[PDB]
Design an enzyme around this catalytic site. Structure first.
Site, PDB file in Angstrom:
ATOM      1  N   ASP A  35      30.465  46.420  32.376  1.00 50.87           N
ATOM      2  CA  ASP A  35      30.978  47.173  33.518  1.00 50.87           C
ATOM      3  C   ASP A  35      31.251  46.260  34.710  1.00 50.87           C
ATOM      4  O   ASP A  35      30.338  45.912  35.475  1.00 50.87           O
ATOM      5  CB  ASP A  35      29.951  48.246  33.895  1.00 50.87           C
ATOM      6  N   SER A 199      47.393  45.493  44.264  1.00 52.01           N
ATOM      7  CA  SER A 199      48.592  45.554  43.452  1.00 52.01           C
ATOM      8  C   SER A 199      49.820  45.629  44.365  1.00 52.01           C
ATOM      9  O   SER A 199      49.772  46.209  45.453  1.00 52.01           O
ATOM     10  CB  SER A 199      48.533  46.775  42.544  1.00 52.01           C
TER      11      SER A 199
END
EC number: 3.4.23.22
Length: 330
Positions: A35, A199
């Site tokens: 994770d 992004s």
């Protein structure tokens, strides 16, 4: 040094991925959920409330010659999905794919929430976010990667998750045969303890890419792709019959639909998520309505590039003094 381990989906939907980890002496092998959105390595154990264990493999520290109890230490974590677990703390030898860390904090669960009990395939979590998020008290402990870092050939790990198939976590090297083209690297903020990046935009299907900044985290421990409501609405508007269902908990669509791809930007480069990756199957057994793999992050407080996005890429988690993320197509 290096390590290399195969990671395997837990079910036919890629809901999560499990990677075998050796703990203790002699080794006890547990299948952990790696994770990159959390920072605790915790396991089902001989100390876990018996009624909360249902099929998991447990770590038994009393059978390990190298286990040490960290005196007085405790841990307690709550995850974004509302699940939780807590307990006490050992250190022990932990190996992943041939890479060994001695004295790794292994957090032994005394209590786990129902979602963990109900998932027989996941024996615990191995956190790979920044150690500043580790929950051990009174003194926070380091992640497996943080402990291994100085010994690695290069201070990196890579995630290469498969679509309906196994993939690979590598530590300490970049497998240049595992991706196409070049890796584009992008800046990371560690301020919130995550692999947080921006992004450069998105496209829906064959649509023209929209240049817009989307801050989010690269999170292998989250199944789906969670993005701003504007972006997600633009995606599902291109799917006939799709709608947001408050009763189901997100966007659903007719199972017979052909889903468009979804593209996200990494600098001037682009990662294309095929439409099939966005199908998470019937909302309930036998239904003709299916659950979508791109959902709104509104109310989470952060955008999450989870498995739906990451499995479309070869991803470099670069733990150099100034961390960065790299993405390549594959």
């Amino acid at each position: 040094s290096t390590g290399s381990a195969t990671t395997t989906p837990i079910d036919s939907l890629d809901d999560a991925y499990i990677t075998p980890v050796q703990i203790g002496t002699p080794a006890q092998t547990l299948n952990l959920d790696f994770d990159t959105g959390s920072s605790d390595l915790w396991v089902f154990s001989s100390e876990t409330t018996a009624s909360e264990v249902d099929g998991q493999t447990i770590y038994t520290p009393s059978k390990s010659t190298t286990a040490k109890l960290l005196s007085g230490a405790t841990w307690s974590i709550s995850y974004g999905d509302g699940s939780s677990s807590s307990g006490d703390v050992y250190t022990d030898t932990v190996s992943v794919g041939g890479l060994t860390v001695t004295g790794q904090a292994v957090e032994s669960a005394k209590k786990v929430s129902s979602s963990f009990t109900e998932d027989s395939t996941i024996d615990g979590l191995l956190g790979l976010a920044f150690s500043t998020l580790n929950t051990v008290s009174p003194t926070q402990q380091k992640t497996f990667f943080d402990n291994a870092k100085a010994s690695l050939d290069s201070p990196v790990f890579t995630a290469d998750l498969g679509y309906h198939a196994p993939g690979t976590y590598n530590f300490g090297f970049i497998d240049t045969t595992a991706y196409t083209g070049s890796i584009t690297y992008t800046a990371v903020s560690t301020k919130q303890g995550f692999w947080e990046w921006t992004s450069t935009g998105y496209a829906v299907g064959s649509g023209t890419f929209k240049s817009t900044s989307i801050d989010g985290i690269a999170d292998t421990g989250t199944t789906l792709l969670y993005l701003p409501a504007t972006v997600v609405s633009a995606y599902w508007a291109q799917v006939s019959g799709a709608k947001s269902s408050s009763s189901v908990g997100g966007y659903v669509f007719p199972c017979s639909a052909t889903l468009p791809s979804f593209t996200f930007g990494v600098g001037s480069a682009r990662i294309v998520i095929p439409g099939d990756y966005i199908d998470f199957g019937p909302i309930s057994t036998g239904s003709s309505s299916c659950f979508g793999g791109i959902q709104s992050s509104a109310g989470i407080g952060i955008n999450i590039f989870g498995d739906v996005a990451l499995k479309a890429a070869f991803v470099v988690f670069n733990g150099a003094t100034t961390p960065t993320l790299g993405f390549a197509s594959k």
